[PDB]
């Protein structure tokens, strides 16, 4: 549903 | 390391709008450019939030929730601060290459959307808010709304929010005051934090209308389009508890 936000929180910065 | 020094080091870098000043201005052009800039600022706000001490210990769903609720308050507050630091005049400093000066404010329907953001920079200037108070306040804005049923890690959230309220108190004590002036300062600043809910309500009204009316041809980047699509049913169903310091 909120694909981009989930990706940015899940990914390693 | 002090907690506010950790909020300081994670401050996002300055983003440019990429605004070509040789080409004439228009409300539509500025609104379009600011929406694209807003998307980039939001992506930077996610990286910022993940670095706030305690935030990544919340359930991933609560991390998403808090960012979805507070995005506009974070944007408007960071804009108010940048405007307050760049000028002593009524200017919205969205980016170094895109400042809404007195001439740009005369553009059709520019003022009515700008006025709510101008309130933020006006208050920060009136209250002479310090860098340390601002940092504590901005983190508190990320923690200013929860779902009406609460969060998955509500006990942990209540502990984190309390820690940053305590941090704001510590920043206030540093401003050469006595108990009675510091009682007034904490009250004044938490009143500005409370007033951010009304500022955001007004900005979201413009935002939601501009996003839903496709005939306006106002483009929103994926990041903002996604948050707005999530937020509209939540406001529609009363799924929001706006935390207040005063009543
Ligand atoms: C976020 C959008 C949905 C909005 N657009 C609308 O709702 C509208 C007008 F299409 F309906 C947009 O909101 C902001 C808010 C802050 C912003 C930006 C761009 N950059 N900054 C920041 C952020 C952090 C920061 O530190 N600084 C220095 C600047 C866009 C907006 C609002 C009013 C007028 C134009 C655009």
């Amino acid at each position: 549903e909120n694909a981009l936000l989930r990706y940015l929180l899940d990914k390693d910065d | 390391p002090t907690l506010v020094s950790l909020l300081e080091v994670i401050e996002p870098e300055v983003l440019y709008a990429g605004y070509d000043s040789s080409v004439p201005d228009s409300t539509w052009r500025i609104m379009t450019t600011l929406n694209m800039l807003g998307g980039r600022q939001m992506i930077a706000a996610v990286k910022w939030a993940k670095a706030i001490p305690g935030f990544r210990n919340l359930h991933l769903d609560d991390q998403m929730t808090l960012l979805q609720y507070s995005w506009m308050s974070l944007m408007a507050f960071a804009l108010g601060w940048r405007s307050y630091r760049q000028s002593s005049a009524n200017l919205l400093c969205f980016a170094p290459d895109l400042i809404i000066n007195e001439q740009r404010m005369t553009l059709p329907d520019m003022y009515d959307q700008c006025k709510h953001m101008l309130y933020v920079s006006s208050e920060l200037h009136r209250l002479q808010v310090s860098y340390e108070e601002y940092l504590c306040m901005k983190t508190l804005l990320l923690l200013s709304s929860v779902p009406k049923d609460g969060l998955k890690s509500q006990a942990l959230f209540d502990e984190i929010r309390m820690t940053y309220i305590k941090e704001l108190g510590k920043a206030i004590v540093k401003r050469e005051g006595n108990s009675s002036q510091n009682s007034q300062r904490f009250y004044q600043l938490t009143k500005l934090l409370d007033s951010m809910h009304e500022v955001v309500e007004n900005l979201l009204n413009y935002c939601f209308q501009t996003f839903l009316d496709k005939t306006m041809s106002i483009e929103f980047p994926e990041m903002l389009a996604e948050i707005i699509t999530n937020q509209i049913p939540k406001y529609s169903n009363g799924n929001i508890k706006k935390l207040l310091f005063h009543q």
Side-chain angles (χ1 to χ4, degrees):
Chain A
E1 202 62 77
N2 266 47
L4 189 57
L5 180 58
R6 186 172 287 103
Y7 171 77
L8 295 172
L9 286 171
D10 269 1
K11 70 170 216 156
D12 286 285
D13 296 327
Chain B
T2 73
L3 198 40
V4 71
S5 79
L6 295 162
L7 297 179
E8 198 282 325
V9 289
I10 63 162
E11 276 285 281
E13 69 190 0
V14 179
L15 300 184
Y16 288 79
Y19 196 86
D20 196 341
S21 266
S22 73
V23 168
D25 290 338
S26 84
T27 305
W28 181 89
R29 197 203 157 184
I30 290 165
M31 280 175 74
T32 300
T33 303
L34 293 181
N35 277 354
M36 301 311 287
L37 174 64
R40 290 170 59 229
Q41 305 271 34
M42 260 320 291
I43 291 173
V46 177
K47 177 185 169 202
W48 165 77
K50 287 170 68 167
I52 294 167
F55 188 80
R56 276 209 72 77
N57 307 115
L58 292 162
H59 194 286
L60 183 88
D61 293 346
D62 299 340
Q63 292 178 42
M64 285 180 67
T65 297
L66 295 178
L67 283 159
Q68 278 157 174
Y69 282 140
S70 70
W71 74 283
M72 186 60 91
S73 47
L74 299 174
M75 300 283 94
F77 200 71
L79 169 71
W81 177 261
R82 216 168 288 169
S83 304
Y84 156 61
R85 301 322 291 186
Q86 257 54 250
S87 59
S88 299
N90 275 233
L91 320 178
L92 285 174
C93 308
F94 283 95
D97 64 332
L98 188 44
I99 296 148
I100 310 308
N101 51 58
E102 67 138 79
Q103 213 168 98
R104 276 168 178 163
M105 214 83 73
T106 72
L107 281 160
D109 312 322
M110 191 61 78
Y111 179 77
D112 285 343
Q113 51 188 280
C114 284
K115 64 183 181 176
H116 302 300
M117 283 159 311
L118 279 170
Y119 168 82
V120 180
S121 44
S122 185
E123 279 298 272
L124 292 165
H125 176 75
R126 182 187 67 85
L127 296 166
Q128 285 287 278
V129 173
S130 77
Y131 188 39
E132 284 188 7
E133 292 168 336
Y134 158 71
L135 294 163
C136 297
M137 285 169 85
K138 193 172 66 184
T139 289
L140 285 165
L141 288 176
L142 170 65
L143 319 169
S144 63
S145 293
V146 295
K148 64 166 177 283
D149 274 325
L151 297 160
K152 287 187 175 74
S153 324
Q154 189 65 66
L156 189 68
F157 172 87
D158 288 337
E159 197 182 310
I160 292 157
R161 202 184 175 256
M162 190 52 70
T163 305
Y164 288 108
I165 287 160
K166 285 180 188 182
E167 272 316 291
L168 178 60
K170 282 177 188 190
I172 290 158
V173 163
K174 286 184 171 166
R175 305 286 305 271
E176 87 117 353
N178 56 89
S179 193
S180 189
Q181 285 182 314
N182 289 328
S183 79
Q184 184 196 267
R185 187 136 193 91
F186 185 82
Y187 177 86
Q188 281 170 305
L189 299 182
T190 54
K191 267 277 177 173
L192 175 53
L193 286 176
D194 274 4
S195 81
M196 282 308 291
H197 292 298
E198 291 177 283
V199 173
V200 168
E201 193 181 42
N202 284 305
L203 295 168
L204 287 185
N205 281 348
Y206 248 103
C207 178
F208 293 170
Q209 185 188 105
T210 281
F211 175 83
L212 291 172
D213 187 358
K214 308 302 173 181
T215 74
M216 294 186 174
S217 307
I218 301 284
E219 177 192 8
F220 286 82
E222 171 182 17
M223 186 71 200
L224 304 182
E226 189 182 276
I227 290 167
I228 299 152
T229 304
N230 175 266
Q231 288 302 286
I232 290 167
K234 285 176 179 177
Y235 279 90
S236 175
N237 297 314
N239 191 25
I240 189 166
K241 185 184 180 180
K242 301 176 176 176
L243 309 175
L244 301 171
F245 284 95
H246 320 275
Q247 200 62 263

